[PDB]
Amino acid sequence: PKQMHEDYCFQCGDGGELVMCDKKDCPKAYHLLCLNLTQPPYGKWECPWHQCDECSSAAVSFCEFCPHSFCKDHEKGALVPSALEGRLCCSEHDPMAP
Ligand SMILES: [Zn+2]
Ligand SMILES: [Zn+2]
Ligand SMILES: [Zn+2]
Ligand SMILES: [Zn+2]
């Protein structure tokens, strides 16, 4: 069946209870504990993928494996292609085995 979000946590890869990103066309979902969330957020909740991890500005480049992402100023040397279909990965993954 079709559903708009992934069935697994984008932080740790495991399923169960997730909070789903309310940002337009974001399929990402996360365990509460995986983001230090203490309770299911109410209202419009956008996930960390959309904010640059270095500063606070909006992300324009994205790690395809975890929610690290980077604004204009911090794209350079942040993402490289990985061995998995060339998908870009942040410095937190081995690019040979992301
Ligand atoms: Zn998780
Ligand atoms: Zn999101
Ligand atoms: Zn930034
Ligand atoms: Zn990453």
PDB file of all heavy atoms in Angstrom, residues 8-15 17-18 29-35, ligand 1:
ATOM      1  N   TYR A   8      10.530   3.398   9.136  1.00  0.00           N
ATOM      2  CA  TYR A   8      11.700   3.203   9.973  1.00  0.00           C
ATOM      3  C   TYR A   8      12.265   4.545  10.385  1.00  0.00           C
ATOM      4  O   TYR A   8      12.070   5.542   9.685  1.00  0.00           O
ATOM      5  CB  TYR A   8      12.765   2.395   9.222  1.00  0.00           C
ATOM      6  CG  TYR A   8      12.298   1.017   8.811  1.00  0.00           C
ATOM      7  CD1 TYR A   8      11.848   0.772   7.508  1.00  0.00           C
ATOM      8  CD2 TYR A   8      12.286  -0.044   9.729  1.00  0.00           C
ATOM      9  CE1 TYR A   8      11.407  -0.486   7.130  1.00  0.00           C
ATOM     10  CE2 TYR A   8      11.851  -1.302   9.357  1.00  0.00           C
ATOM     11  CZ  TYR A   8      11.410  -1.516   8.056  1.00  0.00           C
ATOM     12  OH  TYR A   8      10.970  -2.767   7.686  1.00  0.00           O
ATOM     13  N   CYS A   9      12.957   4.564  11.518  1.00  0.00           N
ATOM     14  CA  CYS A   9      13.598   5.774  12.015  1.00  0.00           C
ATOM     15  C   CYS A   9      14.814   6.144  11.167  1.00  0.00           C
ATOM     16  O   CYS A   9      15.693   5.323  10.957  1.00  0.00           O
ATOM     17  CB  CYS A   9      14.004   5.591  13.477  1.00  0.00           C
ATOM     18  SG  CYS A   9      14.863   6.995  14.223  1.00  0.00           S
ATOM     19  N   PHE A  10      14.839   7.388  10.689  1.00  0.00           N
ATOM     20  CA  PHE A  10      15.941   7.918   9.868  1.00  0.00           C
ATOM     21  C   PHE A  10      17.229   8.074  10.695  1.00  0.00           C
ATOM     22  O   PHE A  10      18.327   8.125  10.143  1.00  0.00           O
ATOM     23  CB  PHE A  10      15.501   9.249   9.231  1.00  0.00           C
ATOM     24  CG  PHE A  10      16.427   9.785   8.155  1.00  0.00           C
ATOM     25  CD1 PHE A  10      16.986   8.949   7.191  1.00  0.00           C
ATOM     26  CD2 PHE A  10      16.697  11.154   8.085  1.00  0.00           C
ATOM     27  CE1 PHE A  10      17.816   9.469   6.199  1.00  0.00           C
ATOM     28  CE2 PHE A  10      17.534  11.678   7.112  1.00  0.00           C
ATOM     29  CZ  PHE A  10      18.091  10.834   6.161  1.00  0.00           C
ATOM     30  N   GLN A  11      17.100   8.121  12.021  1.00  0.00           N
ATOM     31  CA  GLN A  11      18.284   8.174  12.869  1.00  0.00           C
ATOM     32  C   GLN A  11      18.943   6.803  13.079  1.00  0.00           C
ATOM     33  O   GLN A  11      20.156   6.681  12.955  1.00  0.00           O
ATOM     34  CB  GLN A  11      17.992   8.867  14.206  1.00  0.00           C
ATOM     35  CG  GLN A  11      19.248   9.316  14.965  1.00  0.00           C
ATOM     36  CD  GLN A  11      20.107  10.301  14.182  1.00  0.00           C
ATOM     37  OE1 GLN A  11      19.721  11.443  13.968  1.00  0.00           O
ATOM     38  NE2 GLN A  11      21.280   9.859  13.761  1.00  0.00           N
ATOM     39  N   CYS A  12      18.153   5.775  13.374  1.00  0.00           N
ATOM     40  CA  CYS A  12      18.725   4.487  13.768  1.00  0.00           C
ATOM     41  C   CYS A  12      18.337   3.286  12.897  1.00  0.00           C
ATOM     42  O   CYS A  12      18.820   2.182  13.137  1.00  0.00           O
ATOM     43  CB  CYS A  12      18.365   4.177  15.223  1.00  0.00           C
ATOM     44  SG  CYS A  12      16.622   3.745  15.427  1.00  0.00           S
ATOM     45  N   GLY A  13      17.443   3.490  11.931  1.00  0.00           N
ATOM     46  CA  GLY A  13      17.093   2.435  10.966  1.00  0.00           C
ATOM     47  C   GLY A  13      16.035   1.443  11.417  1.00  0.00           C
ATOM     48  O   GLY A  13      15.580   0.614  10.627  1.00  0.00           O
ATOM     49  N   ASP A  14      15.638   1.524  12.684  1.00  0.00           N
ATOM     50  CA  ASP A  14      14.632   0.617  13.244  1.00  0.00           C
ATOM     51  C   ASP A  14      13.230   1.238  13.253  1.00  0.00           C
ATOM     52  O   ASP A  14      13.072   2.466  13.196  1.00  0.00           O
ATOM     53  CB  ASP A  14      15.030   0.166  14.656  1.00  0.00           C
ATOM     54  CG  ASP A  14      16.312  -0.659  14.670  1.00  0.00           C
ATOM     55  OD1 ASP A  14      16.391  -1.655  13.916  1.00  0.00           O
ATOM     56  OD2 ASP A  14      17.238  -0.314  15.436  1.00  0.00           O
ATOM     57  N   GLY A  15      12.224   0.371  13.309  1.00  0.00           N
ATOM     58  CA  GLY A  15      10.825   0.777  13.246  1.00  0.00           C
ATOM     59  C   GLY A  15      10.192   0.842  14.624  1.00  0.00           C
ATOM     60  O   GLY A  15      10.895   0.917  15.644  1.00  0.00           O
ATOM     61  N   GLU A  17       7.350   3.065  17.005  1.00  0.00           N
ATOM     62  CA  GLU A  17       6.644   4.330  17.117  1.00  0.00           C
ATOM     63  C   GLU A  17       7.496   5.501  16.661  1.00  0.00           C
ATOM     64  O   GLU A  17       8.607   5.701  17.134  1.00  0.00           O
ATOM     65  CB  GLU A  17       6.166   4.565  18.540  1.00  0.00           C
ATOM     66  CG  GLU A  17       5.886   6.027  18.821  1.00  0.00           C
ATOM     67  CD  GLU A  17       5.512   6.269  20.255  1.00  0.00           C
ATOM     68  OE1 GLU A  17       4.297   6.170  20.561  1.00  0.00           O
ATOM     69  OE2 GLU A  17       6.438   6.532  21.069  1.00  0.00           O
ATOM     70  N   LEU A  18       6.939   6.293  15.757  1.00  0.00           N
ATOM     71  CA  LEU A  18       7.689   7.346  15.100  1.00  0.00           C
ATOM     72  C   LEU A  18       6.927   8.666  15.124  1.00  0.00           C
ATOM     73  O   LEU A  18       5.710   8.680  15.148  1.00  0.00           O
ATOM     74  CB  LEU A  18       7.984   6.920  13.658  1.00  0.00           C
ATOM     75  CG  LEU A  18       8.720   5.583  13.462  1.00  0.00           C
ATOM     76  CD1 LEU A  18       8.794   5.182  11.994  1.00  0.00           C
ATOM     77  CD2 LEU A  18      10.121   5.614  14.063  1.00  0.00           C
ATOM     78  N   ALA A  29      10.718  10.063   9.388  1.00  0.00           N
ATOM     79  CA  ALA A  29      10.058   9.778  10.656  1.00  0.00           C
ATOM     80  C   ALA A  29      11.119   9.298  11.645  1.00  0.00           C
ATOM     81  O   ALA A  29      12.139   8.721  11.235  1.00  0.00           O
ATOM     82  CB  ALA A  29       8.995   8.718  10.464  1.00  0.00           C
ATOM     83  N   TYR A  30      10.893   9.538  12.938  1.00  0.00           N
ATOM     84  CA  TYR A  30      11.928   9.307  13.959  1.00  0.00           C
ATOM     85  C   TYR A  30      11.333   8.795  15.244  1.00  0.00           C
ATOM     86  O   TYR A  30      10.226   9.192  15.606  1.00  0.00           O
ATOM     87  CB  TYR A  30      12.650  10.606  14.289  1.00  0.00           C
ATOM     88  CG  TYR A  30      13.236  11.340  13.112  1.00  0.00           C
ATOM     89  CD1 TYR A  30      12.454  12.194  12.324  1.00  0.00           C
ATOM     90  CD2 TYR A  30      14.571  11.197  12.791  1.00  0.00           C
ATOM     91  CE1 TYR A  30      12.996  12.877  11.243  1.00  0.00           C
ATOM     92  CE2 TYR A  30      15.119  11.873  11.715  1.00  0.00           C
ATOM     93  CZ  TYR A  30      14.329  12.713  10.944  1.00  0.00           C
ATOM     94  OH  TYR A  30      14.907  13.368   9.881  1.00  0.00           O
ATOM     95  N   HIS A  31      12.070   7.924  15.935  1.00  0.00           N
ATOM     96  CA  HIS A  31      11.759   7.566  17.312  1.00  0.00           C
ATOM     97  C   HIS A  31      11.894   8.791  18.149  1.00  0.00           C
ATOM     98  O   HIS A  31      12.817   9.607  17.947  1.00  0.00           O
ATOM     99  CB  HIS A  31      12.737   6.532  17.866  1.00  0.00           C
ATOM    100  CG  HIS A  31      12.617   5.170  17.246  1.00  0.00           C
ATOM    101  ND1 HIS A  31      13.611   4.615  16.523  1.00  0.00           N
ATOM    102  CD2 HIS A  31      11.588   4.238  17.285  1.00  0.00           C
ATOM    103  CE1 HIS A  31      13.234   3.394  16.105  1.00  0.00           C
ATOM    104  NE2 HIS A  31      11.993   3.163  16.569  1.00  0.00           N
ATOM    105  N   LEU A  32      10.981   8.931  19.107  1.00  0.00           N
ATOM    106  CA  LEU A  32      11.009  10.054  20.048  1.00  0.00           C
ATOM    107  C   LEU A  32      12.366  10.168  20.746  1.00  0.00           C
ATOM    108  O   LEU A  32      13.008  11.225  20.702  1.00  0.00           O
ATOM    109  CB  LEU A  32       9.882   9.940  21.077  1.00  0.00           C
ATOM    110  CG  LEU A  32       8.450  10.186  20.589  1.00  0.00           C
ATOM    111  CD1 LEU A  32       7.556  10.406  21.804  1.00  0.00           C
ATOM    112  CD2 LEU A  32       8.365  11.372  19.637  1.00  0.00           C
ATOM    113  N   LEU A  33      12.798   9.068  21.358  1.00  0.00           N
ATOM    114  CA  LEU A  33      14.072   9.019  22.066  1.00  0.00           C
ATOM    115  C   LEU A  33      15.261   9.373  21.170  1.00  0.00           C
ATOM    116  O   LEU A  33      16.236   9.970  21.634  1.00  0.00           O
ATOM    117  CB  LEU A  33      14.267   7.639  22.723  1.00  0.00           C
ATOM    118  CG  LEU A  33      15.476   7.483  23.655  1.00  0.00           C
ATOM    119  CD1 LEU A  33      15.371   8.391  24.878  1.00  0.00           C
ATOM    120  CD2 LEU A  33      15.674   6.033  24.075  1.00  0.00           C
ATOM    121  N   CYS A  34      15.173   9.030  19.887  1.00  0.00           N
ATOM    122  CA  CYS A  34      16.278   9.267  18.967  1.00  0.00           C
ATOM    123  C   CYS A  34      16.548  10.749  18.704  1.00  0.00           C
ATOM    124  O   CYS A  34      17.579  11.095  18.148  1.00  0.00           O
ATOM    125  CB  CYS A  34      16.062   8.531  17.651  1.00  0.00           C
ATOM    126  SG  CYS A  34      16.340   6.748  17.737  1.00  0.00           S
ATOM    127  N   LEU A  35      15.621  11.608  19.113  1.00  0.00           N
ATOM    128  CA  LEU A  35      15.762  13.047  18.936  1.00  0.00           C
ATOM    129  C   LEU A  35      15.617  13.791  20.263  1.00  0.00           C
ATOM    130  O   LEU A  35      15.385  15.001  20.285  1.00  0.00           O
ATOM    131  CB  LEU A  35      14.762  13.567  17.887  1.00  0.00           C
ATOM    132  CG  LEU A  35      15.056  13.178  16.424  1.00  0.00           C
ATOM    133  CD1 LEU A  35      14.069  13.847  15.482  1.00  0.00           C
ATOM    134  CD2 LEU A  35      16.482  13.536  16.021  1.00  0.00           C
TER     135      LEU A  35
HETATM  136 ZN    ZN B   1      15.482   5.679  16.103  1.00  0.00          ZN
END
